[PDB]
Amino acid sequence: QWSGARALEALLTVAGELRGPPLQLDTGQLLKIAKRGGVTAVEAVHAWRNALTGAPLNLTPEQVVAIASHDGGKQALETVQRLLPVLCQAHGLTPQQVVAIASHDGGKQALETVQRLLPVLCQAHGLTPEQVVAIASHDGGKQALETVQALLPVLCQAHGLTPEQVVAIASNGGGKQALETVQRLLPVLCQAHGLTPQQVVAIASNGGGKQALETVQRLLPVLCQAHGLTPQQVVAIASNGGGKQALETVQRLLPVLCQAHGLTPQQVVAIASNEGGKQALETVQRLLPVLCQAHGLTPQQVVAIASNGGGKQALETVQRLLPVLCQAHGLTPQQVVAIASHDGGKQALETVQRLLPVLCQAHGLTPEQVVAIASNGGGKQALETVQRLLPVLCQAHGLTPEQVVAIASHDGGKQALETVQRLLPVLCQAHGLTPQQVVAIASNGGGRPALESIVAQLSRPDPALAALTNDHLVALACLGGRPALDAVKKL
DNA sequence: TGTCCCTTTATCTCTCT
DNA sequence: AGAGAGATAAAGGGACA
Ligand SMILES: [Mg+2]
Ligand SMILES: [Mg+2]
Secondary structure (H helix, E strand, O other), X not given: OOOHHHXXXXXXXXXXXXXXXXXXXXXXXXXXXXXXXXXXXXXXXXXXXXXXXXXXXXXXXHHHHHHHOOOOHHHHHHHHHHHHHHXXXXXXXXXXXXXXXXXXXXXXXXXXXXXXXXXXXXXHHOOOHHHHHHHHOXXXXXXXXXXXXXXXXXXXXXXXXXXXXXXXXXXXXXXXXXXXXXXXXXXXXXXXXXXOHHHHHHHHOOOOHHHHHHHHHHHHHHHHHOOOOOHXXXXXXXXXXXXXXXXXXXXXXXXXXXXXXXOOHHHXXXXXXXXXXXXXXXXXXXXXXXXOOOOOOOHHHHHHHHOOOOHHHHHHHHHHHHHHHHHHHOOOHHHHHHHHOOOXXXXXXXXXXXXXXXXXXXXXXXXXXXXXXXXXXXXXXXXXHHHHHHHHHHXXXXXXXXXXXXXXXXXXXXXXXXXXHHHHXXXXXXXXXXXXXXXXXXXXXXXXHHHHHHHHHXXXXXXXXXXXXXXXXXXXXXXHHHHHHHHHHOO
């Protein structure tokens, strides 16, 4: 018969038991493990469902799924059971960091490499464990750690980079390649092209950093001499992964989009300057004559939607959802363009289409309140979080729907909301902050870490903030979040 | 195939003023 | 708040054994 039958049945036999305790996996979770981790991962999750969730380890089910769902997932699962207590006691890592290191293709290699190299990277190269964790927490982590161990001295001394810059380069998939390409090309790009080290670091500091570096070296001259692009614009384009693809595409499409479609070089650069920029550029070439037709959307609007990561996905979702959202849900194209014009534009739009009636009917929000929550990066996360937490924040903590909406209406709205649910009790009950002040701190980008910093300072007080009253901490948190507090801590 | 590494795309969260 | 920066995830190919 068909080969993969004996495998698929073996997959389904086991996945039946995983559905209940201890792990209680949902079809969705089982698909994810099967897809990436494969069949070996699913059988392992089962083989050891007790060892990981029980004791010592006490992994959550989601942490188990996180580690299992990668090529080699079984190897990682086995390695985690052996190395988690060692890394957590010998090197002072938290279980969550260990999990985070494990949760990538080659997790075992990364974990074993952290075990081996973390003391030498910290003592001989003066890196922090945080920094070693961040480098390890990508595919090929092992390669990036060994390459950092090998190239830190030459990069800092012969090339002038700071160790923070080296970590930033190493801290992506393909970190090793980025590191070596920076070693080779840094003088070429600085001397032959007038680039600063900082700009080169920005180009090298994404996935496929190597490809972007080589492609800036190759395409910067054409792009600057022949199309009159400045080196700032080429760097902006290249500093986002898929960089190479975006640069190669801009070379072709810049004159086309400018001549045949009436865009400025400036607008093309903006569309190109995002993850998957090549896809955005191409979708705009295709869809500008269509979306801007029947006196419909303006080019400016089309460009705005395109000028975010996943601009392609956002543009296509606009094309498909604009009529049903306007007609059946009462929205304007203005509002629709607004939802689409952030990273995750597609997700936000589909979640609006799905949740607007429930948010209004069951929760008594206005369509405008839904549009505002939706109109930030992470819109979908915020909307789904508002659906779950609006009733519990109002009834358990006395918050008004308005206040919930204000917390939700920012990037990271979901994190801010969950953090308000968590910390409002201690902030108010135990430290006498008014609910209004918690709301105020939470109603900004960076809401979550702002609240966590406030709690950190009140629960385990640092005398470097002694001369600051609660009212003053609060004003600082509102004004500048965690960064403000942390700076104040440095005084 | 199982595992490890790399690149590209999309999505989500926080920073800096 | 808007631009910029900083993370995290998903899926696919190349490689090798
Ligand atoms: Mg970026
Ligand atoms: Mg594969």
